[PDB]
Amino acid sequence: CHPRLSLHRPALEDLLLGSEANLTCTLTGLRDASGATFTWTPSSGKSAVQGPPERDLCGCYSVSSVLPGCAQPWNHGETFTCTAAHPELKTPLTANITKSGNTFRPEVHLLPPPSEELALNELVTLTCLARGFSPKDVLVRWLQGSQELPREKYLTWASRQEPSQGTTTYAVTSILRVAAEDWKKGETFSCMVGHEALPLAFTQKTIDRGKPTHINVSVVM
Amino acid sequence: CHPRLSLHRPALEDLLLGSEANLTCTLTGLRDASGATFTWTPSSGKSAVQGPPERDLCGCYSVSSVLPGCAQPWNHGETFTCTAAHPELKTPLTANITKSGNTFRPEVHLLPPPSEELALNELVTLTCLARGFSPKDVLVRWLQGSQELPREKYLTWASRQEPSQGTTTYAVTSILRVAAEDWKKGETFSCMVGHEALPLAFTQKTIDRPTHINVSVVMA
Amino acid sequence: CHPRLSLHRPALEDLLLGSEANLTCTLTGLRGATFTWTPSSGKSAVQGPPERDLCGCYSVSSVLPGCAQPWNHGETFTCTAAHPELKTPLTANITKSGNTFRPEVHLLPPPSEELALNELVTLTCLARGFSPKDVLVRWLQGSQELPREKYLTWASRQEPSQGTTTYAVTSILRVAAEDWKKGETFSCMVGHEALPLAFTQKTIDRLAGKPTHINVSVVMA
Ligand SMILES: *[C@@H]1O[C@H](CO)[C@@H](O)[C@H](O)[C@H]1NC(C)=O
After folding, report:
1. Which long-range contacts (CB under 8 A, 24 or more apart) does B203-207 make?
2. B119 with C221: Cβ contact below 8 A
3. In chain B, which residues have their Cβ closer than 8 Å to the Cβ of C214?
4. Could you tell me which residue ranges the Ig-like domain spans (chain B)?
5. Of B64, B77, B153, C184, which sits 20 to 30 A from B84 (CA to CA)?
């Protein structure tokens, strides 16, 4: 029962919303000495910060390695490297990370409300569904008109892997509940999806009251 | 480290299409290798369940104490207390379990496939929603025709506490990918929603595949 | 013959798409020179390798790169020059804009007089009422982003109100009639500094211009 080292990726919210990029390197498990020598093999000057004295169960002392400024080298195709050596673990070990290939673009649907509650006039559901993208990293946001709703007025599941033929694609869902007065009045809403395979980082679908046309023809003798 | 105590519940996956009766309360923290029944309260149907597990290490153990009597005391809110006294305990570790009610019922809707997804005719998508009640676990099976499918052609998420006003409620969804021409031949599909607020613990719903032209002729 | 100094805000196509965002100070003269930047930022600049303009004085530029987070953070930048023909050093400065406004985007359906000739249909995108005058416009078909050589966008003029100062811009895209009658969908995207998620999208297809009900009556009397 002892862990080995591996390397995470930058967060997609930070990488897409324009702010920054980090890169984390972790080992843990036992409350031992602060000779946790983290060393980064590529480093443009501003090297890492040996992070805060974090604790885990039965005093499992975790400290990490985090470096700022990792947008352009991660995005154009570098190959980063983290190595470490400990007082207890004086035998050094190394992990690698690489930005993935073999990408597919998502497909996003928004679906109208449920005739059963369309008659009830209490609350309506709008469900957003995305399907068929290559890494398991997405964003979902909802809007109304031009105003962004807060992140507490809906719920979203995690991205499961779908089982189908050959390759491994993913999917994720979310639902939104809104009262009926504005829905029958004519207010509109939107579902946005962020993913790193789209060329402009985002797509957006909107829905509103999809009905067919009426035709009345009458002959009077 | 820590010998612990934590609150558990009978796993309700075995009361709808299951015929057995166990309790679902494993070790609270730590013990040693034993024959999985430590003595509780009941002199009520002494038909005690058993089974010897192997030995475990790395801090904890893999040893429970399971005792029967599940669906027969399932009327009026009785407690069942997980007991285990193996010599790492500095006191007899009589745990406790409290069962609340206020069980609410699913509101299952279904809905057509998306409109612009049917200009390519590769596959067909249907989604099945199930929302709004106080307990946690729900099951689901998909069927084409009338007989229920195995667990190798659908996908189902977990259940989250939905953001609602006033109440404490949940939700769960699941999707289905079938072919185009089989949907085009008028085949029908249903999802079953099994919960313990339903009278018979099943629910179904299914639609399938419109102009509004009306002509009227009156005289004089 | 005459000396001059300038700065420039970073371009929006680099602030929004790929974050390597420059910041340019020019000097137009030398009819040899050193530049100084008051925020330190570690990484020094590069001088222009000094082309000429307007049949006269050969200008010289210098570009401080890697300033994408202090631009959005609200910081201030000044660059100070020096030259033999200058008595005093010249200085200038640049800040991010305050009191912004976000745009309103509309996508209009084609005129019905156009569908009777079976050649090409015309889509129109309009964005109106945004306070800093810089913007981007991109078109799509389904998910495929179209190349830039297939449409036409105008510049960003100033619109005549009395309240504040605001701006507007248009764009057209002409697609084929056979692809319009099949049910292909098309989209318009706008990027602005003052939008919260940096992009907004509107779409269209062969429905949604059709009327909701038709009443015909023929009277044989
Ligand atoms: C810097 O910019 C301000 C406006 O923000 C201007 O008033 C001033 O003249 C500039 N130059 C300085 C402080 O040298």
Report:
1. B203/B106, B203/B108, B205/B108, B205/B109, B205/B110, B206/B110, B207/B110, B207/B112
2. no
3. none
4. 3-98, 106-208
5. B77
